[PDB]
Amino acid sequence: GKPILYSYFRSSCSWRVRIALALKGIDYEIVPIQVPALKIDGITIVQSLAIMEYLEETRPIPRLLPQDPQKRAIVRMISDLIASGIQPLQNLSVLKQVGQENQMQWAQKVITSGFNALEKILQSTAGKYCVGDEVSMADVCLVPQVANAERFKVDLSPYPTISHINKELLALEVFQVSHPRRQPDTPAELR
Amino acid sequence: GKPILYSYFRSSCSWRVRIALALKGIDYEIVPINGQQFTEEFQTLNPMKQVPALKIDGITIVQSLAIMEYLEETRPIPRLLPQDPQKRAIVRMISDLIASGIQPLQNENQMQWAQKVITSGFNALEKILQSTAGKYCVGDEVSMADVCLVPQVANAERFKVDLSPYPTISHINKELLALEVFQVSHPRRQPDTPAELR
């Protein structure tokens, strides 16, 4: 009857989809545990980018992607930079399969390298959010990545644009109700 | 003036964009990659010295997925994405599985790692294609999934991955490699291919 997100409280990819579901006003059921997976309109969709593009097309407002194709490409660039460039190079597969202390070093080089790139891009693109003054898919991707950075003790002081946009976004209900610390599978001593 | 693609002959990401450019009949100029005129342009909206990068319609787009969506929208035919939203999700799933899942995890026994990554993904992707594939990844029309599949399958052969356990991937792969748009864009037919790959 109602959509099902297979989710994990610590998965940045799952949070993206929870922000996008909340943003589109879609009520869903959470089954905690490949995640995210989303059962919707009688089909199953893996991969948060794919999920979010489906949501954008079937539930247009609010827009994750602006109307001007050129603007859409910048929002997609940033999003994919996060989802294809930073995040996979610090997936749980990679981390536990290379020590329990090296995992943090490698994670920090990856996140800093991407944030060095992304912060420079945002000097051109950002208004109040990643691309101009309207929330986009880029913002949905950013916040969960910035939360990873905090988790691996990345200092955000060299990334003042990323940090400002991040705090603008975390002030919105759709980024709070979907928070890793407000989930069914959230450990009681992390709230 | 024509679009400019900054490319690398071995980058599977660059190949994706060459396939899509060729598919949509778009003529472009290739600037292959490792003065400050060319370095400034390369690195505008690309502080990471990344390929592919595409200069088109007066702007710069990095990230192959972003570039192909832009192409899809501005030059609709031939379709990289079908019209049915649910079919578009399946095409995007496969593409993203490759572009976000398999490929990023592999830019001594770095061979043991490449192979584990590629096999694990193809285990997943072969199973999905049992449901979706006709003559191509999703039904009988070439799509974004196919554009992503060929350059990943070429990586798999480079890292000596045996394709015997993946007959659907291997069939679709050879269907695609028979098409002009995947041949003219091939890593071996590029300006920066070193002659020792020919």
UniProtKB/Swiss-Prot annotation, chain B:
List Phosphothreonine occurrences by residue: 119
Location of the GST N-terminal domain: 1-79
List, for all copies, the residue spans of the domain called GST C-terminal.
84-195
State any GO CC term: mitochondrion
Q: Where in the cell is it found?
A: Cytoplasm
Fetch the InterPro entries from UniProt.
Answer: Glutathione-S-Trfase_C-like, Glutathione-S-Trfase_C_sf, Glutathione_S-Trfase, Glutathione_S-Trfase_N, GST_C, GST_Zeta, GST_Zeta_C, GST_Zeta_N
Instruction: List the GO molecular function terms.
Output: glutathione transferase activity; maleylacetoacetate isomerase activity
Q: Give residue numbers for the modification (Phosphoserine).
A: 120, 164
According to the UniProt entry, what is the EC number of this protein?
5.2.1.2, 2.5.1.18
Q: In which pathway does it act?
A: Amino-acid degradation; L-phenylalanine degradation; acetoacetate and fumarate from L-phenylalanine: step 5/6
Q: In which tissues is it expressed?
A: Expressed in liver, kidney, seminal glands and breast.
Q: Which residues carry this modification: N6-succinyllysine?
A: 49, 160
Where does it mainly reside? cytoplasm
Needed cofactors? glutathione
Enumerate the PROSITE patterns for this protein. GST_CTER, GST_NTER
- Which residues take part in binding glutathione? 11-16, 37, 51, 63-64, 103
Q: Which keywords, in A-to-Z order, does the entry hold?
A: Acetylation, Cytoplasm, Isomerase, Multifunctional enzyme, Phenylalanine catabolism, Phosphoprotein, Transferase, Tyrosine catabolism
Q: Main role?
A: Probable bifunctional enzyme showing minimal glutathione-conjugating activity with ethacrynic acid and 7-chloro-4-nitrobenz-2-oxa-1, 3-diazole and maleylacetoacetate isomerase activity. Also has low glutathione peroxidase activity with t-butyl and cumene hydroperoxides. Is able to catalyze the glutathione dependent oxygenation of dichloroacetic acid to glyoxylic acid.
State how it assembles. Homodimer.
User: What family does this chain come from, according to its entry?
Assistant: Belongs to the GST superfamily. Zeta family.
Quote the NCBIfam families the UniProt record gives. Answer: maiA
What is the protein name stated in its UniProt record?
Answer: Maleylacetoacetate isomerase
Organism in which the protein naturally occurs: Mus musculus (Mouse)
- Taxonomic lineage per UniProt? Eukaryota, Metazoa, Chordata, Craniata, Vertebrata
Q: Which gene encodes it?
A: Gstz1
